[PDB]
Amino acid sequence: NGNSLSAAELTCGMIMCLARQIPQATASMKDGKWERKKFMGTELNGKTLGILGLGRIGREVATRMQSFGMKTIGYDPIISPEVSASFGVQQLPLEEIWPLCDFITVHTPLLPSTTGLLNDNTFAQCKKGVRVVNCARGGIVDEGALLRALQSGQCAGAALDVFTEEPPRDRALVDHENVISCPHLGASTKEAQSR
Amino acid sequence: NGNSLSAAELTCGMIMCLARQIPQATASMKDGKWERKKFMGTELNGKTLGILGLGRIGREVATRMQSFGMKTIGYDPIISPEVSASFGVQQLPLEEIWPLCDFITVHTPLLPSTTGLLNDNTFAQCKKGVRVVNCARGGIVDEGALLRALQSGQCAGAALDVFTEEPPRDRALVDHENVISCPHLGASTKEAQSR
Ligand SMILES: Oc1noc2ccccc12
Ligand SMILES: Oc1noc2ccccc12
């Protein structure tokens, strides 16, 4: 609400970080290395971003990423397709979303229907090399399934602000070379903090 | 041209990384830490972005950062104020730009007139806490002056894709906690590479 924009901005930051491996490149630089060929990335323009959860944060993410030329599609059980069209999000059923996306971002509450929304089944339906972002609630993305998808290359990268347990006690995700992370910083701006 | 969008996209990534310290937070997480107060950041909405160089890259940066609610102002001696108005950038003389900006990004060639465009004299005219990006040409930002500004806090952070010498032999900038960097990745996308 107040803090909608801080979350939406972090999410868009994470999308850009996944496309260009900025965190990993800075780490490489700080370790004294100049590794240009390693950190070959991708352009956002013309890519498809799937947005799962089309409330305020989802809508804000959409309109920012639309300025990058991304195609924004998505799904939300409550919001009508004509309403999401009005903010440039094409709604399709979930089963249709997975194979189209280059990037997926989640913006749902944590409910039975959204716990493990991304799981071994839904990762297998994605395009090989999909990049995922969770700046919403820990557990929306099944962490074990994510790890397996990163290990196989079915997922080329992931950005996590939130974890099933905080701080995460299992470190295998965090430590993966294709995972970027923050300690639940979505609301952590001076502005959000200070109404 | 071909590669305009890859440079512009990286620049926008770097601005979001400065606002939220994504690379430093990832490093902290990978070292097993959970440091929430350390990485309190700022919101981009409502802030002023100064764009120095209003050719194709500069214009693309402007229109993307406008979607975040940033006020975009700038300077370019060759681009008419009418042309820059067409993409929502108010041109002002340099002297008027420095004090207004929360963020500054450079998109000029390297010429006598732009070597040290940001230097001790122009840092001194900036708002305390300014954040700077150079994804254009190494030497636009004077490296010794940038280090002095980061040491005093006159500059709160900087993002560098390019250096006066590549790789930089002096590591004090790269090693600073408030500096984000990449090994000249601006054109390093699969797309740019493959027309
Ligand atoms: O409850 C939900 N809010 O947004 C969703 C998106 C996908 C599946 C379920 C939900
Ligand atoms: O000479 C210049 N080329 O582009 C510029 C932008 C700002 C200030 C000077 C110049």
Author numbering:
A (entry chain A), B (entry chain B): 100 to 294
Authors' description from the paper:
Human 3-phosphoglycerate dehydrogenase (PHGDH) is responsible for the NAD+-dependent conversion of 3-phosphoglycerate (3-PG) to phosphohydroxypyruvate (PHP), which is the first step in the de novo serine synthesis pathway. Thus, PHGDH activity diverts glycolytic flux into biomass production. Limited proteolysis with thermolysin revealed a stable fragment of PHGDH consisting of the core of the catalytic domain containing the cofactor-binding site, and this was shown to crystallise readily. Thus PHGDH-93 provides a valuable tool to investigate binders to the cofactor-binding site.
Soaking of all 15 fragments into PHGDH-93 crystals was performed overnight at RT using a fragment concentration of 80 mM in 20 % DMSO. All of the fragments for which crystallographic data were obtained bound to the adenine-pocket suggesting this pocket to be a preferential site for fragment binding. Analysis of the fragments’ binding modes showed that four of the fragments (5, 14, 15 and 16) were coordinated by hydrogen and/or halogen bonds, whereas the other three fragments (3, 9 and 10) appeared to be stabilised only by apolar contacts. Fragment 16 (3-hydroxybenzisoxazole) made one hydrogen bond with the side-chain of Ser211 through its hydroxyl functional group (Kd = 6.5 ± 5.7 mM). Despite a similar bicyclic structure, fragment 9 (5-amino-1-methyl-1H-indole, Kd = 11.1 ± 5.0 mM) bound to the adenine pocket in a 180 °-flipped orientation compared to the 3-hydroxybenzisoxazole. Based on the fragment crystal structures, fragment 16 was selected for modification to further explore the binding site and potential vectors for fragment growth. The binding mode of fragment 16 revealed two potential routes for fragment growth: (1) growth out of the cofactor-binding pocket from C-4 or C-5 and (2) fragment growth from the 3-hydroxy position along the cofactor-binding pocket from the adenine site towards the nicotinamide-binding site. In addition a small hydrophobic pocket adjacent to the fragment was detected that could be filled with a small hydrophobic group by substitution at position C-6 or C-7 of the benzisoxazole so as to increase interactions with the protein. Through growth of fragment 16, the binding mode of some of the new modified fragments compared to the parental fragment had changed. This is likely to be due to the fact that fragment 16 initially only formed a specific interaction with one side chain (Ser211) of the protein and thus, through growth of the parental fragment, e.g. further addition of functional groups, the position of the new fragments can shift in order to be able to increase the number of specific interactions with the protein.
